[PDB]
């Protein structure tokens, strides 16, 4: 479950929250002409508290 | 390449969790235990565009 | 004349898609029920049926089940590569 | 072009690597017909005389460069990717009728 997600960055540390401050300021200089953006990935999760009613109730 | 032609060939779709429930469930739809993609013949209401 | 109505429709190069989320909406890449309790810890095995219009010659139902297909690459050392790879669910 | 996921956007570092990958010779697969006839009993051929790799370097300054790889082989700085489809492929038969 969680260590697995955590190890690939299934749900986790956002890009620059994980990789080395030296890291994110390189890339930061260096946008302009060579990007890395692709090689590290970013986690995207869906809010689980809250959101949709658990119960039984029609769409439409 | 990704150059499917043959969607509309579908009727319906079920989804059995545990052999028991039925996915969603919960009264979702308007057919609450299958996803009728189309239907034909049929039309008491519950058609669109 | 006499008529009837006929209707049908077209849709092609897409692919139907059910999401496995409460409300069926892309709020994420790691949908609610992705990480439910339920589908947390519990097996389950999944029945599906399908109902096609019959044709005259044999045809192949492509199933896609969404999953997480990840590598980490590591290069520690000079001329050194390894690959750490995870698939979720249905994993290899 | 590469288009396997793990390795179409890897930033590979210094040192001495084998390369290695596979061709087809089938027609029926490398070639597109519009009438979709069969080019195997048409007469089809396909032959190979050279194949070669081709591969540009960013003229980066040394002393950045050689940061770059300083700071690209610690364990936190693990290029990640994924598989844009991310889904496994199942295929079922349905019989005629």
Redesign the interface.
């Known amino acids: 479950?969680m260590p697995?997600?955590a190890?690939?960055?299934?749900?986790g540390q956002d890009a620059s929250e994980?990789?080395?401050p030296?890291?994110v300021q390189?890339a930061r200089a260096?946008d302009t002409?060579?990007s890395?953006g692709?090689?590290?990935?970013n986690?995207?999760?869906?809010?689980?508290h809250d959101?949709?009613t658990?119960?039984?109730?029609?769409?439409? | 390449d990704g150059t499917f032609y043959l969607n509309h060939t579908f009727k319906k779709v079920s989804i059995m969790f545990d052999s028991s429930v039925s996915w969603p469930?919960?009264?979702?739809?308007?057919s609450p235990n299958e996803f009728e993609i189309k239907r034909t013949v049929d039309g008491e209401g519950y058609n669109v565009a | 004349v006499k008529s009837v109505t006929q209707k049908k429709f077209l849709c092609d190069r897409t692919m139907w898609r059910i999401p496995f989320?409460?409300?069926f909406m892309?709020?994420?890449?790691?949908?609610?029920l992705?990480?439910?309790m339920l589908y947390?810890?519990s097996a389950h095995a999944l029945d599906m049926t399908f109902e096609v219009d019959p044709m005259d010659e044999p045809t192949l139902l492509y199933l896609l089940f969404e999953v997480?297909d990840?590598?980490?690459v590591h290069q520690p050392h000079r001329g050194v590569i390894e690959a750490?790879y995870?698939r979720?669910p249905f994993s290899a | 072009p590469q288009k396997f996921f793990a390795v179409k956007?890897?930033?590979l570092l210094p040192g001495s690597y084998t390369y290695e990958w596979n061709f087809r010779k089938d027609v029926n697969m490398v070639l597109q017909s519009s009438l979709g006839n069969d080019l195997r009993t048409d007469g089809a051929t396909i032959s190979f005389t050279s194949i070669n790799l081709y591969a540009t370097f960013?003229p980066?300054a040394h002393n950045?460069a050689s940061?770059?790889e300083a700071?690209?082989r610690?364990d936190?700085?693990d290029?990640?990717?994924?598989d844009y489809l991310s889904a496994a492929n199942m295929l079922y038969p349905i019989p005629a009728n």
Not at chain 1, 38 to 41: A, D, L, P, Q
Not at chain 1, 43 to 48: E, F, K, Y
């Open positions: 479950m697995q997600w190890y690939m960055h299934i749900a994980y990789l080395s030296g890291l390189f260096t002409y060579f890395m692709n090689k590290f990935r986690p995207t999760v869906a809010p689980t959101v949709t658990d119960r039984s109730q029609r769409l439409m | 469930g919960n009264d979702r739809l308007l | 989320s409460s409300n892309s709020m994420g890449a790691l949908t609610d992705g990480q439910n947390a810890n997480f990840v590598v980490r750490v995870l979720t | 956007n890897l930033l960013f980066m950045t940061t770059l700071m690209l610690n936190t700085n290029q990640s990717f994924n």
